[PDB]
Design a protein around this motif. Structure first.
Motif, PDB file in Angstrom:
ATOM      1  N   UNK A  73       1.941  26.307 -21.939  1.00  0.00           N
ATOM      2  CA  UNK A  73       1.670  25.660 -20.665  1.00  0.00           C
ATOM      3  C   UNK A  73       0.224  25.152 -20.535  1.00  0.00           C
ATOM      4  N   UNK A  74      -0.675  25.560 -21.431  1.00  0.00           N
ATOM      5  CA  UNK A  74      -2.043  25.061 -21.416  1.00  0.00           C
ATOM      6  C   UNK A  74      -2.239  23.882 -22.369  1.00  0.00           C
ATOM      7  N   UNK A  86      -1.981  -5.456  -0.212  1.00  0.00           N
ATOM      8  CA  UNK A  86      -3.390  -5.810  -0.408  1.00  0.00           C
ATOM      9  C   UNK A  86      -3.530  -7.200  -1.040  1.00  0.00           C
ATOM     10  N   UNK A  93      -1.789   2.873 -15.079  1.00  0.00           N
ATOM     11  CA  UNK A  93      -1.201   3.930 -15.924  1.00  0.00           C
ATOM     12  C   UNK A  93       0.241   3.577 -16.361  1.00  0.00           C
ATOM     13  N   UNK A 146      -2.466   5.269  -8.597  1.00  0.00           N
ATOM     14  CA  UNK A 146      -1.765   5.948  -9.691  1.00  0.00           C
ATOM     15  C   UNK A 146      -2.632   6.432 -10.836  1.00  0.00           C
ATOM     16  N   UNK A 147      -3.678   5.704 -11.154  1.00  0.00           N
ATOM     17  CA  UNK A 147      -4.511   6.075 -12.296  1.00  0.00           C
ATOM     18  C   UNK A 147      -5.230   7.405 -12.057  1.00  0.00           C
ATOM     19  N   UNK A 165       0.827  -1.205   0.000  1.00  0.00           N
ATOM     20  CA  UNK A 165       0.000   0.000   0.000  1.00  0.00           C
ATOM     21  C   UNK A 165       0.865   1.261   0.000  1.00  0.00           C
ATOM     22  N   UNK A 166       1.877   1.285  -0.863  1.00  0.00           N
ATOM     23  CA  UNK A 166       2.708   2.490  -1.081  1.00  0.00           C
ATOM     24  C   UNK A 166       3.404   3.088   0.144  1.00  0.00           C
ATOM     25  N   UNK A 167       3.733   2.206   1.091  1.00  0.00           N
ATOM     26  CA  UNK A 167       4.414   2.561   2.305  1.00  0.00           C
ATOM     27  C   UNK A 167       5.886   2.605   1.985  1.00  0.00           C
ATOM     28  N   UNK A 172      -3.173  15.644 -15.130  1.00  0.00           N
ATOM     29  CA  UNK A 172      -3.541  16.163 -16.461  1.00  0.00           C
ATOM     30  C   UNK A 172      -4.420  17.398 -16.309  1.00  0.00           C
ATOM     31  N   UNK A 190      -4.367   9.609  -9.578  1.00  0.00           N
ATOM     32  CA  UNK A 190      -3.283  10.565  -9.409  1.00  0.00           C
ATOM     33  C   UNK A 190      -2.855  11.139 -10.752  1.00  0.00           C
ATOM     34  N   UNK A 191      -2.705  10.286 -11.759  1.00  0.00           N
ATOM     35  CA  UNK A 191      -2.262  10.735 -13.080  1.00  0.00           C
ATOM     36  C   UNK A 191      -3.323  11.584 -13.719  1.00  0.00           C
ATOM     37  N   UNK A 248       3.991  14.037  -7.155  1.00  0.00           N
ATOM     38  CA  UNK A 248       5.395  13.754  -7.409  1.00  0.00           C
ATOM     39  C   UNK A 248       6.217  14.887  -8.027  1.00  0.00           C
ATOM     40  N   UNK A 290      -3.019   4.829   0.210  1.00  0.00           N
ATOM     41  CA  UNK A 290      -1.873   3.998  -0.157  1.00  0.00           C
ATOM     42  C   UNK A 290      -0.622   4.830  -0.482  1.00  0.00           C
ATOM     43  N   UNK A 291      -0.166   5.522   0.550  1.00  0.00           N
ATOM     44  CA  UNK A 291       1.045   6.321   0.507  1.00  0.00           C
ATOM     45  C   UNK A 291       1.550   6.689  -0.871  1.00  0.00           C
ATOM     46  N   UNK A 292       2.714   6.148  -1.218  1.00  0.00           N
ATOM     47  CA  UNK A 292       3.465   6.645  -2.357  1.00  0.00           C
ATOM     48  C   UNK A 292       2.751   6.427  -3.689  1.00  0.00           C
ATOM     49  N   UNK A 293       1.618   5.725  -3.704  1.00  0.00           N
ATOM     50  CA  UNK A 293       0.773   5.699  -4.905  1.00  0.00           C
ATOM     51  C   UNK A 293      -0.080   6.968  -5.067  1.00  0.00           C
ATOM     52  N   UNK A 309      -8.669   2.942  -1.360  1.00  0.00           N
ATOM     53  CA  UNK A 309      -9.146   2.468  -2.642  1.00  0.00           C
ATOM     54  C   UNK A 309     -10.193   1.373  -2.563  1.00  0.00           C
ATOM     55  N   UNK A 352      -6.617   0.354 -13.682  1.00  0.00           N
ATOM     56  CA  UNK A 352      -5.286  -0.022 -14.127  1.00  0.00           C
ATOM     57  C   UNK A 352      -4.272   0.806 -13.357  1.00  0.00           C
ATOM     58  N   UNK A 412      -2.721  21.590 -17.157  1.00  0.00           N
ATOM     59  CA  UNK A 412      -3.351  22.575 -18.023  1.00  0.00           C
ATOM     60  C   UNK A 412      -3.976  23.780 -17.322  1.00  0.00           C
ATOM     61  N   UNK A 459       6.940   6.743 -12.327  1.00  0.00           N
ATOM     62  CA  UNK A 459       6.672   6.174 -10.997  1.00  0.00           C
ATOM     63  C   UNK A 459       6.723   4.676 -11.152  1.00  0.00           C
ATOM     64  N   UNK A 485     -12.747  -0.865  -8.618  1.00  0.00           N
ATOM     65  CA  UNK A 485     -11.338  -0.594  -8.268  1.00  0.00           C
ATOM     66  C   UNK A 485     -10.352  -1.186  -9.289  1.00  0.00           C
TER      67      UNK A 485
END
Ligand code: MN
Ligand code: MN
Ligand code: MN
Lengths: 587, 587, 587
Positions: free
Chosen positions: B72-73, A299, B289, C61-62, A181-183, C69, C64-65, C95, C88-91, C13, B287, C73, B200, B283
Motif C-alpha cells: 500500500x506504500x 471559463x 492529467x 484535475x492536475x 467549471x465542473x458544475x 499520489x 487533484x491527481x 473521487x 470548479x466543482x467536479x474537477x 484556479x 494540463x 502512499x 475522470x 494556470x
C-alpha cells in the motif's frame, strides 16, 4: 402545432331508454369541461387550448377505438374522461400509458358517475396505467350542470400539468457549450432528457456561436435596433473594476454590441430565423427546435469574449427590442437541470423565470452581528440571499402590477409596454468584474420588491435513484436601506438581488431557515412567481420524479390515485410509486 | 508514479522443518516471477516494470497484512501469488476487490502448489473476488526452477492486461469539444469512464483551443522549430479542391501553422507544459492529467478554422518535430469510445494506434464488376476498406521493420530516427476538401503495407447492458496497383488507406467478410498491430466488459477462473460473469 | 501503520490576482483543520492522529491527481476537503468511493466557500460517491479564522466516525470456536465482515486454546506475575453452588490458573507475542491481526474446562497485571455481532465496552408487586436489567472519575493505576454455577453506579435486508439497597448488573420502556459510555447500515448529504440510501 386535450364522455351502454336518457347530460358534461379549460387557461406561449371531444358517447371498446382514432389525427396529449353514470370499467378506459389522464365522475345519486370513477381507477391501478381522480365533495342533483370549485381546481391543476408534459415531448434542449467549471448540472445527461421528458439534447460547441458573430449570420439591422433600444432604455451603473482594467467607451460599446448579438444568435439557434434563409444561409435558418437552452460561458468563452450576463437577462425576460414576447429559457453556466426547472416553471405559469445562485444564509444572529439591528417581519427567522452571477429575467424586478396594484410577475400576454419599460427602469447595467470575466460584460442589477409570493425549485440527478425535485415556497422580503446596502456591498453589489424568506413547517428541512439552505441540493435554484408548489408536485408525479423536499400543505397534493395505494405517507408513497412506474418514455 | 506489481510468496505455516525446507524455493519462485516480468515487459510509456516482493513468505493473515501494508506504500495495482506447496486457503489470499490478481501454483508432486491454487481459486469465487489461474501443463521436478512456456505466456498476458487496468486508474479523458455530427461515441459518458475504467472526464469547449492560439499560450519558438521540421520533412499531394475554393501559397502556409499549433496546444492541455510557467502562464501549464483525448472538430470548428487532420495524425504517431516519443491517443470527431479502444490498444502493446472509418466492404463480385479482375490471396474472400477522415498515425504506413525485415509497427523505444523519417517519407500531405472543411487543413495520406497482421477493436455502449468489446483479428492486404488506384479514386483518395481482411471461422459474424462488416457496432474502429485479441479478451474480463464479437481461438481465451463456473460456453459464461461482478470501481 | 486523515485545500484556479489573494487563507483553513483533529482526537489505541495536507491548493484535475499520489502512499483512509472560495466543482472533488469524505465550506460573503460546497455535493450525489456537508450556521467575516462550535462538532463527529471505518479495514475478527447454543450472532457471517466492514474472519477451534495451555505456548514468567497480581487484588465472593459441587482451594487455584491462561492465550492469538518467538515457537508468535474476537465457551468448552468469565472480563478491561492498556474486544458466546457493536463503540470512544444479556424488563407495576416500593427518579417509567452471564469489563463499575467528582468510563490514556486498582476493588469474583459451567470458573461481579449516561447498541443480520443497527440512549440508575437485593437474588446474584433507563420519546418503540425491550432484536446488547447515539448514526451511514431503532434528537442526525435526496423522513431516506449505495467494499 400544439398539443390538444381529449375529452372522453363515457356512458352506460344498455338501451331501453337508459342510455338515451343519459346522452344529453353526458355530452354536455364533456362540452362544459372543454369550455372551462379554454376559458380559464392558455398554453404557455399564449395560444388558446383546443379541446377535442369524441363524436359519440363511449360505452365499450368499439366507441373507444373510434374516439382514439379521432384523438390520434389531432395531436392530443392529455385526456379527460367524464361521466354522470355507471359505465363498464375496463371496457371504457383510456389504455394509452403515455398521456396524462384524469377521470371526472359527477357526485350524484340518480347520476352515480363517481361509482364509475372508483372502478375505472381500480382498473387503472390494476393495469399499471395510473390516472388522476376528480371527485367533488358535495352531492349534486341530477340536473345541476355547474362545475363546483373543488372540481375546477382539480380540472385546471391537472390540465395545466398535463399540457406541460405534452409540450416538452418531442422538443430539444440546446447545450451551447459543455460543462461549466465542473458544475454537475452542466454535464448534460442525455438519457434523463429522453427518458423522463421525451426530449432530445442538441449539443453545439461555443465556437458555433463565435462563427455566427464573426461571419454575419444574423439580421444586421436587428442589431442596430437592439443598440438603439439599449441607448433609449439602459441606465448604467458604476464600473467597480480597478482602474487599469476599466474599459473606455469604444471598448464599452463593442462589448454591448457583442452581448446583444449573443442574445440574437442564441435565440436564432433555439427557434430558427427566416431572415437568414433570405441571405443565402439556408442551413443555419432552421434552428434546433429547442424550448430551453444552456450557455456554458465560464471559463472558455469568458476568458476572451464578453459574458452572457446581458443575453441571459434579456432572453429570459418577457420582452426585448422587438417588444413583449414569451420568455425563453436559457440557463446560465449550461446548468441544464436548473434549465429543466425553469422549463417546468414556464410551462406551468406562462411567466418568466429567474435563475439564481443560492448564495448566502443570513441568520438572525448574523444579521445583528454585522448591522447592529434585527431581522423583522417576514424575514424574522432568517433569510436567504438569491443572486445570480450576472443575469436574471428583468421581470424579477417585480415592477409589473396586479389588479390591486401589488408587485408581481405576469404572463407576457398581459404585460403592457408601460410595465415592460418600468422593469428596465428598475435595472442598472453594471460592468463585469474583469478578472472573472476577462472579455467584459454588463450585469443586469435590480432589487426584487418585498412581500411577493415565490416558489423556489431545483431538479437534481442522483445516481442510483435518478431525478428528484426540490421545492420551497416563500416570500421576497424588503430590507431597510442601511441593512440591504451593507449585506449587498459585502457580497456582489453589481448583481441582481432577491431576499427570500421560506415558509417553515417546524418539521425536517423546514424546521428553520438554515435547514432549507443546507438541504438544497445544488448552488443554483429557480424562482417562479406565486405559490405554485402544488402545480410542481402534480407535474413531478406525471413524470415519475420523486419530490425529495417540499413545504406544500398536505391537502393540496394532487397525484394519480394509484399513489394512495403505495401508502398513506405522502413521501413514502411517492418514492415507491415512482420506483414502480419508472420514467414515462423508456426505461 | 507508475503502478507496481506486487508478488506474494505464500507457504505452509507449520514448522518442525516443513516451512523451513520450503522458504528458499518459495521466495526464489517469487523473485523469478519478478525477473521474468521485468525482462520481457515494459510499461506503455517505456519505463521498466517494478515488482515489489513481500518481506517474508505468507502463511496466514498476520504475514498477509504485513505484505498489504508494504504494497500500500509502493503503488501496487496488480498482484501475483506464487507457491510450490500447500497453504491455508482463505487465510492467505489477496482480499482486495479492486486489483487484478492471479495465482501461480507450481505443478509438482513433492511440491503441490497447484493443489493450493485450486483451493485458493475456490475461496476467491466463494468470496466474490475473482482471480486468474496459472497452472502449467507438465509435472515438474521439485528442484526444477525454469519456467515453462505455457506458464510464461499466461504470466505475461496477465501482467500486460493488469498494468493496463492500473495505468488507466486515476487518469483523465480530455474532451476538446462536445458531440460531433451526432456520433454516439462523442456523447461522452462520464459514468462509463468513472465506473468501468476508474477515470475522470474533463470537458473543455473548443474556444479554449482558439484562445490558446490567439492569446499565444504556447512555446513560440517550438512553433518555428516545428514549421522548419514540417518544411524539411513534408511531401505534399495534389490539391483536389475546385479552383475557386483553392488556397494560395500564403493562405496554405497559415493553415499549416495553425494545424501544428493545434497539435501543440492539445498536447499541452493533455499533459501540461512548463514553458508556459516560464512565460507567466501558471494556470495553463498544469494540463489536465489526460492519457487520452478527443477533438470534436466538425462541424463548429471546421466551419471556420483549419481541421485537426495534421494535429491528430502527428499526435497519434510515435514521433514529431521533437523526435521519437511515446504516441498520444487522440480520437478524431471526439469519438471517446474509439478513444477507449485506442487507449486499451496502446496500453496492451506500447505502439501507435490507427483510428479508422470502417468505410466499405468490397465483396468478390463487387470488385470483379468494377475492375474486371478478381480478389485473390489473403483478400480472396472480400475486403474491408479502412480509412479515417484525414488522420492516422504515420506508424500505420508500416514502413518500420522487424528483425526479419518484415513491415510492422513497433513500441516507440525500438524505433530508430531512420524509421521515423521513413514513415514521414511514405506520407503525402493533402489539402482538406473546402466544402467539408471550410477553414482548410492537411490530411495524412499513406498506403498501409500488405501482409501485416492487425487487430480491429471497438467499444460500444448498449443501454440496458453497458459497455461491450468487439474484436476482429486479420491481415492488411496489398492490392495490385490498378485495383487500388481504381477503388481509391472512387472513395476518398486524399485520405490514408488500409485494406483489411479479417480471418473467418465459419460461424456467426465470422461466417463471411460481409457479416464482419455488418455486425460492427459503429462507423469507426481501431487497428492495433499483431494478433492481440487474446490480450484484449483478458483485459475486458478484468474490466467486466462482455465481448460480444471476436474471432480468437478457444484455447487462447484467458479469463478469471470463476468465469468457468458461469458455464462451459465461452460466451454465456462471459455475459453472466460480467452481469454478476459488474463494473470494477463503482456500482 | 495507522490510518491518516487527508486534507484537501481547494481554490479558484484563475490567476491575475484572484488565486493569489486566496492561497494564504485556504491553506491555513487546511492547517487549522488538521490542527483541530490532532489536538482534540486520538486513535482508539491512544496514538496521535497524523494528518496529511496536499502540497498545493487544488483548483482542477492536475493538482487533484497530485494530491492523490501523495495520499495513496500515506495510508489516508478519510478526506476533508476545505475551501473559503468558489472552485470548479467536479474537477476538484475526491473521487475515491471507499473513503469517508467530508467537505467544509466557509460561510462568508466575500469568501463564499459554502457555494462551492453545494455544487460539489451535487457532483458527489450525481456520481454516486456521497459526501458529508460541513456548513456553519453564521456568516463569518473574511478575516475570521476561528472555527465555530457547530463546525467543530461536525468535523470531529465525521473524523471520529471516519477513522473507525478505516481502522477496521484489513483487520481480522478471530472466532475462537463456532456456535454457542444456537445464538444467531455466533453463526459468524464471513460475507458480512468482508463486504460491510472490510474485515476478514479467522476461525479457530477451541482445541487450539487447549493446545496453547497444555504444551505451554505462553509466557511462563508472565504467568507467575498474573497470579501474584490476582492474589493481591482478587476479592473472592460467596460460593453459591450446592455443597457437593464446591471445590477445594487446590482445585479453585487450578481454575484461576487456567482462567488467566485463557486471557493470555486469547490475547496472544489476537495480536501476536514476541516472547513466543524467543521461546522457539515461531508460528504461534504472529497472531491473526485481530481487533475483535469471540469465545464460544458453551456448551463444549464449559462442560469440561473453566469458563471464559475471568478472561473475558479482564481482556475487555482497560487494565490487568501489566498495567493500563487499550482494552481488547472479546465477545462471550462468540456473539460476533455483539462483537461488532463493541468494536464500533471502542472505535468511537477509545473506551472499554460492556457486553450484556438484555435480561429482564421490570415494569412499574411489577416492582411494586415484588418489592412494595415504587420506581422513582429516572427509573419511574420502567427499568431494564443489564447483566452478562458472568463477565464484563471492570471499567463498567464506573469507579473511574472524570475531571469532576462524577462516575464514568474513560479512554485508557486518561486512567490512573489508582483508578485501575479501584475498579478491581469494587468487584467480587464469584465461582461459576457447576451445573451450567461444569469446568468451574469465576464470575466478575460488580454493580454500576447510577446516573451515568449510557448508549445501548446491537447489530443484527436480517435475511433479505442485511445488517441493521439498534441504538438506545439512556442512563444507569441506582436503586434502594433493599429493592436491588430482591431483584438481584431473584435473577443471577453472582453476575455483574447495570440498571438501565432508556430515554423515551412518546412514539414508536420509545413510546414506553416495554417497547424498547420488545423491539430489541437480540438477547444481547452492548453498553457504551455517554450519549454516543449520533456517533453510531454517522458511522452507520458511512458503512451503509440502516438504523432500524434510535432515540436520537432529529437535529443531531449527521449523514452524507445525498441521504437528504432520498427523502425528508429521516428513516425512509436511510433505508432508500443504504439500499442504493449498498455495502462499501463489495456487493
Ligand atoms: Mn452561478
Ligand atoms: Mn468519421
Ligand atoms: Mn446469553
Amino acid at each position: 402545432s400544439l398539443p390538444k386535450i381529449g375529452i372522453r364522455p363515457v356512458i352506460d351502454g344498455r338501451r331501453m331508454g337508459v342510455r338515451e336518457s343519459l346522452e344529453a347530460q353526458t355530452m354536455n358534461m364533456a362540452k362544459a369541461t372543454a369550455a372551462l379549460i379554454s376559458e380559464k387557461l392558455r398554453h404557455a406561449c399564449g395560444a388558446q387550448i383546443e379541446c377535442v371531444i369524441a363524436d359519440t358517447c363511449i360505452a365499450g371498446m368499439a366507441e373507444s377505438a373510434a374516439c382514439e382514432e379521432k384523438f390520434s389525427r389531432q395531436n392530443v396529449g392529455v385526456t379527460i374522461t367524464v361521466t354522470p353514470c355507471w359505465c363498464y370499467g375496463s371496457e371504457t378506459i383510456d389504455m394509452d400509458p403515455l398521456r396524462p389522464k384524469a377521470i371526472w365522475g359527477f357526485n350524484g345519486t340518480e347520476r352515480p358517475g363517481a361509482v364509475y370513477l372508483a372502478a375505472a381507477l381500480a382498473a387503472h391501478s390494476q393495469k399499471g396505467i395510473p390516472a388522476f381522480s376528480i371527485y367533488g365533495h358535495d352531492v349534486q342533483d341530477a340536473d345541476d350542470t355547474t362545475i363546483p370549485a373543488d372540481v375546477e381546481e382539480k380540472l385546471l391543476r391537472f390540465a395545466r400539468a398535463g399540457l406541460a408534459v405534452a409540450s416538452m415531448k418531442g422538443k430539444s434542449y440546446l447545450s451551447v457549450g459543455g460543462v461549466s467549471m465542473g458544475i454537475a448540472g452542466s454535464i448534460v445527461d442525455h438519457n434523463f432528457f429522453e427518458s423522463w421528458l421525451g426530449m432530445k439534447v442538441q449539443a453545439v460547441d461555443m465556437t458555433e456561436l463565435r462563427r455566427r458573430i464573426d461571419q454575419k449570420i444574423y439580421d444586421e439591422v436587428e442589431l442596430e435596433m437592439a443598440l438603439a433600444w439599449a441607448d433609449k432604455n439602459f441606465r448604467y451603473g458604476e464600473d467597480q473594476n480597478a482602474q487599469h482594467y476599466k474599459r473606455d467607451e469604444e471598448q464599452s460599446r463593442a462589448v454591448l454590441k457583442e452581448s446583444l448579438l449573443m442574445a440574437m444568435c442564441i435565440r436564432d439557434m433555439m427557434q430558427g430565423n427566416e431572415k437568414l434563409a433570405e441571405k443565402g444561409l439556408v442551413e443555419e435558418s432552421l434552428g434546433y427546435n429547442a424550448i430551453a437552452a444552456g450557455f456554458q460561458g465560464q471559463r472558455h468563452w469568458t476568458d476572451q469574449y464578453p459574458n452572457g450576463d446581458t443575453a441571459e437577462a434579456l432572453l429570459n425576460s418577457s420582452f426585448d427590442w422587438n417588444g413583449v414576447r414569451e420568455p425563453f429559457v436559457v440557463a446560465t453556466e449550461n446548468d441544464s437541470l436548473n434549465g429543466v426547472a425553469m422549463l417546468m416553471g414556464h410551462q406551468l405559469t406562462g411567466t418568466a423565470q429567474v435563475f439564481a445562485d443560492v448564495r448566502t444564509y443570513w441568520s438572525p444572529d448574523a444579521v445583528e452581528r454585522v448591522t447592529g439591528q434585527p431581522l423583522t417581519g417576514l424575514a424574522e427567522h432568517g433569510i436567504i440571499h438569491l443572486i445570480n452571477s450576472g443575469s436574471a429575467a428583468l421581470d424579477g424586478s417585480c415592477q409589473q402590477r396586479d389588479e390591486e396594484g401589488k408587485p408581481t410577475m405576469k404572463p407576457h400576454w398581459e404585460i403592457s409596454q408601460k410595465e415592460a419599460d418600468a422593469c428596465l427602469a428598475a435595472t442598472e447595467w453594471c460592468p463585469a468584474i474583469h478578472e472573472y470575466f476577462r472579455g467584459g460584460g454588463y450585469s443586469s442589477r435590480f432589487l426584487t420588491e418585498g412581500g411577493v409570493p415565490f416558489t423556489m425549485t431545483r431538479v437534481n440527478l442522483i445516481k442510483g435513484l435518478g431525478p428528484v425535485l426540490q421545492i420551497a415556497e416563500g416570500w421576497s422580503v424588503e430590507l431597510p436601506k442601511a441593512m440591504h446596502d451593507q449585506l449587498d456591498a459585502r457580497t456582489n453589489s453589481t448583481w441582481p438581488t432577491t431576499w427570500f424568506a421560506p415558509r417553515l413547517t417546524g418539521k425536517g428541512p423546514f424546521a428553520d431557515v438554515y435547514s432549507v439552505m443546507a438541504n438544497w441540493g445544488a448552488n443554483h435554484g429557480v424562482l417562479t412567481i406565486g405559490h405554485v408548489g402544488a402545480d410542481f408536485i402534480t407535474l413531478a408525479a406525471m413524470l415519475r420524479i420523486p419530490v425529495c423536499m417540499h413545504n406544500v400543505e398536505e391537502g393540496k397534493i394532487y397525484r394519480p390515485s394509484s399513489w394512495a395505494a403505495h401508502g398513506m405517507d405522502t413521501e413514502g408513497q411517492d418514492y415507491r410509486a415512482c420506483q414502480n412506474y419508472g420514467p414515462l418514455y423508456k426505461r
